[PDB]
Structure 1
Amino acid sequence: DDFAYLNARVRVRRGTLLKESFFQEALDLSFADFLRLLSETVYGGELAGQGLPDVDRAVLRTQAKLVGDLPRLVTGEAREAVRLLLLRNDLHNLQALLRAKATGRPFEEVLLLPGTLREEVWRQAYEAQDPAGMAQVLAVPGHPLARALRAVLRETQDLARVEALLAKRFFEDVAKAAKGLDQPALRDYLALEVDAENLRTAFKLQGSGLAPDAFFLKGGRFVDRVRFARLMEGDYAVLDELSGTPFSGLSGVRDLKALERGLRCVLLKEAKKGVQDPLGVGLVLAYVKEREWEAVRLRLLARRAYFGLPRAQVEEEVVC
């Protein structure tokens, strides 16, 4: 088991989270100066090159050593909990690996990382060509995407459809486990994260050629399978009947930028109150969310700084 040491290490690491006043000074900066600014902080100890892809890799190396070792440093109930947050990034990693296997293109041009599923596991999966070999490799850690996969892949081996159904079964299983750890901050975070996911998923995956009801998930509020199909066709009249959410004020808006800003800023504030339950997974949950949103923000600023895009194109996003 055991979160005591883990929680203690994670608090010390908070001492080096990038502050809001960073991103104020940063907006006034071009790319060369942002890099000089960036190298002072802890991402800076992994910063390399003057190219943009070399920065992207430098973010990945920071994330590896400060977030991706975290399931490994603890066991039992603690490992399952840290795992559940990391699983969602593993789900991006599996989908990309699986696609490289199915479409016959290199291992390369995927985003991997270590956590529950290590760098070599993904390498082993790629190297097990047969779907059955593939299925057993993934069963080795025993992790919830395996158990979702075993059920899913029996029905159908159509790639885009495997992904979709892998997501729904994976989320039905997750929703229960995360509600079930009985931490009130995580449960409140979970209901909004789910409501938010159903909305967001419909925007991204419209025009895929798949079912609407293969993108629904357990934790959902006023939303139902019928409404998800309504949205996937492109109707925002679902939102004027959606209420009780704190997202209720993003209703009536068609502008993509303004909607996504509002969902994201709420979830940020929600997770930050996770320190009112630092016990358990609270403190690491808060940590993962703040460090992800800083990396996104590092990337938005860099691009804005290099290419001469407006100050306001990112200044609005960085202050919630």
Structure 2
Amino acid sequence: DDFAYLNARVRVRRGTLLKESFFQEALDLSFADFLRLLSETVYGGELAGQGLPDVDRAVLRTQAKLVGDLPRLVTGEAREAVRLLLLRNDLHNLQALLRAKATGRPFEEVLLLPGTLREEVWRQAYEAQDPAGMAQVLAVPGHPLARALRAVLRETQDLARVEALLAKRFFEDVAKAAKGLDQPALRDYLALEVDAENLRTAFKLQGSGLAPDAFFLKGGRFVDRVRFARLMEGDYAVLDELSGTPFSGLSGVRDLKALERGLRCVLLKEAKKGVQDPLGVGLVLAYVKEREWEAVRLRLLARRAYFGLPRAQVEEEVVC
């Protein structure tokens, strides 16, 4: 819709993000000190445990209520865009349900995050005895995962292939839709992310040598099949060709750890472009990403603090 209501909600929420210095501060703490530091920020209102998993829960609970609510207000057009972001998180979870279902593992110890779909949707879905029945559970308001699933379900009920292609198909759905709206910024974020995801997919599998088409996602803007293939043959020279683009740092990066670390920074720059859009979804989109990056930092730094592992070992990870 009108992004008026939404924007305002995000602005208050933007009020509880910390400053750089928090993250800077967290580094010389102890776990005790962490417990106190954490207890004074907004997450602190659900901090009251004493162990590390309790921190994880605090994050979960805080994010559950502060983000997990937002599309749900009304599912207006703008809300639909937002719905896509959070939906990506359901997709992973959904996939987790597919593996869980397939070896039938007592579901109850599979713990899925809150996304947009309700907890009872997961439980019922589990009680839906087939991926077709499951898709019908999803089908109820009309859901892009339903549709991705319907398209995939025709070719095989081979679980693993289904998970891969379902995700692949899901981003194909997202791509058409995102291209379909008035959100140059979303079109860009999705697009760079797709490219980045391909690039990483290609990077990670070096030393398999398979046919590229099984792994090449759709939505590119800097990744074409030929480069993709080339990296999949192991040719790193692919990485020197996207210099000057938003991917300029890809020169000389031949390890995965560093690669993702850089890539994550690039997408961070993209989230920052769309800043404070009453124009549309640019602002909410940015907020969501920011909260994740915060979350990453809370949990990791909590752990770092918890076990007292060297400061220097971790410092790069919050450093873009």
Q: Please say whether Structure 1 and Structure 2 have the same fold, judged by a TM-score greater than 0.5.
A: yes
Q: Distance in 2 between matches of 1:91 and 1:6?
A: 24
Q: Answer with 254-263 or 162-171: which moved more.
A: 254-263
Q: Per the alignment, do residues 187 and 131 of structure 1 end up closer, same or farther by CA in structure 2, a change over 3 Å counting?
A: closer
Q: Per the alignment, do residues 158 and 244 of structure 1 end up closer, same or farther by CA in structure 2, a change over 3 Å counting?
A: farther
The offset of 1:303, in angstroms, is: 1.7
Work out whether residues 167 and 215 of structure 1, in 8 Å CA contact, stay in contact via their aligned partners in 2.
Answer: no
- State the SS of the aligned residue for 1:237: helix
Work out whether residues 83 and 116 of structure 1, in 8 Å CA contact, stay in contact via their aligned partners in 2.
Answer: yes
- State the SS of the aligned residue for 2:59: helix
The superposition leaves residues 282-309 of structure 1 with CA deviations (integer Å, 9 ceiling, x where unpaired) of 1110110000000011111112112222
Q: Distance in 1 between matches of 2:71 and 2:217?
A: 25
Q: Distance in 2 between matches of 1:204 and 1:144?
A: 28
Instruction: List gaps (5 residues or longer) in structure 1.
Output: none
Work out whether residues 243 and 249 of structure 2, in 8 Å CA contact, stay in contact via their aligned partners in 1.
Answer: no
The offset of 1:210, in angstroms, is: 8.5
Work out whether residues 14 and 287 of structure 2, in 8 Å CA contact, stay in contact via their aligned partners in 1.
Answer: yes
Q: Distance in 2 between matches of 1:250 and 1:74?
A: 41
The superposition leaves residues 271-292 of structure 1 with CA deviations (integer Å, 9 ceiling, x where unpaired) of 1222253322111101100000
The offset of 1:114, in angstroms, is: 3.6
Work out whether residues 223 and 242 of structure 1, in 8 Å CA contact, stay in contact via their aligned partners in 2.
Answer: no
Q: Distance in 1 between matches of 2:131 and 2:219?
A: 31
Q: Answer with 36-45 or 238-247: which moved more.
A: 238-247
The offset of 1:179, in angstroms, is: 2.6
Work out whether residues 202 and 231 of structure 1, in 8 Å CA contact, stay in contact via their aligned partners in 2.
Answer: yes
Q: Per the alignment, do residues 130 and 210 of structure 1 end up closer, same or farther by CA in structure 2, a change over 3 Å counting?
A: farther
Work out whether residues 209 and 232 of structure 2, in 8 Å CA contact, stay in contact via their aligned partners in 1.
Answer: no
Work out whether residues 185 and 277 of structure 1, in 8 Å CA contact, stay in contact via their aligned partners in 2.
Answer: no
Equivalent pairs counted in the alignment come to 320
The offset of 1:106, in angstroms, is: 1.7
Percent of counterpart pairs with the same letter?
100
The superposition leaves residues 48-68 of structure 1 with CA deviations (integer Å, 9 ceiling, x where unpaired) of 422222211211111110011
Q: Distance in 2 between matches of 1:51 and 1:149?
A: 39
Q: Per the alignment, do residues 3 and 276 of structure 1 end up closer, same or farther by CA in structure 2, a change over 3 Å counting?
A: closer
- State the SS of the aligned residue for 2:107: coil
The offset of 1:235, in angstroms, is: 4.1
Work out whether residues 274 and 283 of structure 1, in 8 Å CA contact, stay in contact via their aligned partners in 2.
Answer: yes
Q: Answer with 301-310 or 203-212: which moved more.
A: 203-212
The offset of 1:224, in angstroms, is: 2.9
Q: Per the alignment, do residues 16 and 56 of structure 1 end up closer, same or farther by CA in structure 2, a change over 3 Å counting?
A: same
TM-score for the superposition, normalised by structure 2: 0.91
Q: Answer with 130-139 or 82-91: which moved more.
A: 130-139
Q: Distance in 2 between matches of 1:2 and 1:135?
A: 31
Q: Distance in 1 between matches of 2:211 and 2:61?
A: 37
The superposition leaves residues 104-155 of structure 1 with CA deviations (integer Å, 9 ceiling, x where unpaired) of 1021343423443211111111011133322211212311111010010111
Q: Answer with 256-265 or 141-150: which moved more.
A: 256-265
Q: Answer with 300-309 or 197-206: which moved more.
A: 197-206
The superposition leaves residues 238-291 of structure 1 with CA deviations (integer Å, 9 ceiling, x where unpaired) of 213344532232222113332222111121122122225332211110110000
Q: Distance in 2 between matches of 1:146 and 1:156?
A: 16
Q: Per the alignment, do residues 246 and 155 of structure 1 end up closer, same or farther by CA in structure 2, a change over 3 Å counting?
A: same
Q: Distance in 1 between matches of 2:135 and 2:271?
A: 34
Q: Per the alignment, do residues 233 and 318 of structure 1 end up closer, same or farther by CA in structure 2, a change over 3 Å counting?
A: same
Work out whether residues 27 and 311 of structure 1, in 8 Å CA contact, stay in contact via their aligned partners in 2.
Answer: yes
Q: Distance in 2 between matches of 1:20 and 1:256?
A: 26
Q: Per the alignment, do residues 154 and 101 of structure 1 end up closer, same or farther by CA in structure 2, a change over 3 Å counting?
A: same
Q: CA RMSD in A?
A: 2.3
- Tell me what 1:90 maps to: 90
Q: Per the alignment, do residues 118 and 204 of structure 1 end up closer, same or farther by CA in structure 2, a change over 3 Å counting?
A: farther
Q: Distance in 2 between matches of 1:8 and 1:206?
A: 46
Q: Distance in 2 between matches of 1:190 and 1:281?
A: 13
Q: Per the alignment, do residues 72 and 208 of structure 1 end up closer, same or farther by CA in structure 2, a change over 3 Å counting?
A: farther
Q: Per the alignment, do residues 183 and 131 of structure 1 end up closer, same or farther by CA in structure 2, a change over 3 Å counting?
A: closer
Q: Per the alignment, do residues 23 and 204 of structure 1 end up closer, same or farther by CA in structure 2, a change over 3 Å counting?
A: same
TM-score for the superposition, normalised by structure 1: 0.91
Q: Answer with 106-115 or 9-18: which moved more.
A: 106-115
Work out whether residues 145 and 170 of structure 2, in 8 Å CA contact, stay in contact via their aligned partners in 1.
Answer: yes
Q: Per the alignment, do residues 198 and 97 of structure 1 end up closer, same or farther by CA in structure 2, a change over 3 Å counting?
A: same
Q: Distance in 2 between matches of 1:116 and 1:9?
A: 17
